[PDB]
């Protein structure tokens, strides 16, 4: 537990931990910002990676490859419980095409599909506005932090911008088609994205550190976890598991990100849909009437409109599987929602794989922290790329709600930062 330097930036620090304790070994890691607090999850002891056809689990080198079957939420929460047979704390993220299974969808999955990342740490280092706590941190991992001590954290260089103007996805064109098929009554609500090509490469802890001093989230990460880097301000709790037993789930969570009771009646509308949904999902995995809505609608600093649900888990279904239960959210794919999804692989680029998943924290008390993940910037390889969406209803046009995701982009665009 050290003292912060004074009038320097938690943020600033801990991506630039981040960055040090990378260039140190050739370390994956997450950082991931909560409320107040900055955990950067520095090394890897273990990984779960569970794709669309394989479970890999890989260790000191050596990768343990397997088959697995129904509800990828029981495959995973297994291979999660023995990475925590011996630590506290898991990290990684799940795909959007985790929630695929439940709409029997996973046969339009192509053969090697991302499904899920965790991954227990070597170090864990809290950062706050007063302290830097360490957890587990070895000789290699003290120094890297006495180094970033010595000197102080870079300065940040130029930011360069992206121009979002152009297509070529062609939403425009996929929006119109969507806006067709809720006119036929095929659906409600479909949530399509938009990626944005960036040339350049990012800089990554550095693209986050400056987006993080003009943007102000609730949650916000920064990874470089399967070989992939992401880095995100869009997270919201969706569903957290008690070590009690208790199953929290925030069935509004993301209608911050996607943005007279006469006009916001839609709002209203689709508030109690998404409510009466995710009620009806946890209930299919909670002990008989132990579900229930316990804040409505209220207006819960930017101000979304907002519901929590509570229930009890069992004595026989697990924290993965109330994951599933409640995968993907309402408010990332549509409604219906069975039709969203499917919507969402007819209409939109797939996979999707963490633009519209999310984050997952979890604990050996046999806990969970879900948050759903929108507007992130992404590298795999070469192409480094911004993706966002918008909620596309039978009244939409093409046209605003392309400059409705121009906006939704610019969030991220000018702080881009080269490499």
């Known amino acids: 537990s050290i003292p912060m330097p004074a009038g320097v930036n938690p943020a ?7 960055a040090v304790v990378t260039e140190s070994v050739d370390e994956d890691y997450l950082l991931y ?7 950067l999850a520095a090394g890897v002891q273990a990984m779960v990676e569970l794709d669309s056809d394989e479970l890999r689990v890989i260790r ?6 397997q088959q697995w079957s129904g509800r990828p939420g029981a495959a995973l929460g297994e291979a999660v419980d023995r990475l925590l047979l011996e630590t506290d704390q898991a ?3 799940v795909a959007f095409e985790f929630g695929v299974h439940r709409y029997g969808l996973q046969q339009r999955l192509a053969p090697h599909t991302p499904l899920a990342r965790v991954f ?6 809290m950062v706050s506005e007063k302290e830097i706590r360490l957890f587990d941190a070895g000789i290699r991992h003290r120094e890297a932090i006495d180094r970033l001590l010595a000197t102080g954290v870079r300065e940040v260089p130029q930011s360069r911008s992206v121009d979002v103007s152009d297509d070529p996805s062609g939403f425009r064109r996929r929006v119109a088609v969507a806006v067709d098929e809720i006119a036929a009554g095929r659906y409600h609500k479909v949530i399509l994205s938009r990626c944005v090509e960036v040339p350049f490469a990012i800089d990554f802890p550095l693209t986050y550190r400056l987006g993080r001093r003009h943007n102000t ?9 399967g ?10 709790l969706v569903t957290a598991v008690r070590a009690d037993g208790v199953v929290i789930t925030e069935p509004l969570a993301g209608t911050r990100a996607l943005g007279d009771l006469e006009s916001n009646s839609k709002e209203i509308v689709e508030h109690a849909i998404s409510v009466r949904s995710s009620l009806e999902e946890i209930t299919d995995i909670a002990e008989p009437g132990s579900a229930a809505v316990i804040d409505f609608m209220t207006v819960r600093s930017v101000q979304h409109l907002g519901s929590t649900i509570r229930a009890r888990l069992d004595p026989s279904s697990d924290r993965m599987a109330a994951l599933e239960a409640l995968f993907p959210a309402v408010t990332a794919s549509g409604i219906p929602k069975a039709a969203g999804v499917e919507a969402i692989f007819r209409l939109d680029e797939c996979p999707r794989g963490l633009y519209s998943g999310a984050v997952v924290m979890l604990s050996a008390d046999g806990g969970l922290d879900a948050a759903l993940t929108l507007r992130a910037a992404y590298q795999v390889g070469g192409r480094t790329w911004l993706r ?15 400059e409705e995701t121009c906006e939704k982009l610019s969030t991220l665009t000018p702080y881009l930062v080269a490499r």
Request: with cysteine; charged share 30%.
């Open 12 to 18: 600033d620090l801990a991506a630039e931990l981040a």
């Open 60 to 65: 000191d080198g050596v990768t343990r490859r």
């Open 217 to 225: 989230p609730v949650r916000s990460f920064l990874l470089q976890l």
């Open 33 to 39: 910002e909560c409320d107040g607090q900055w955990v």
């Open 91 to 93: 990290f990684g993220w």
């Open 120 to 125: 227990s740490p070597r170090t864990r280092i």
């Open 388 to 402: 966002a969406g918008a909620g596309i209803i039978e009244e939409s046009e093409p046209e605003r709600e392309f």
């Open 227 to 236: 070989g992939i880097r992401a880095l995100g301000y869009s997270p919201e």
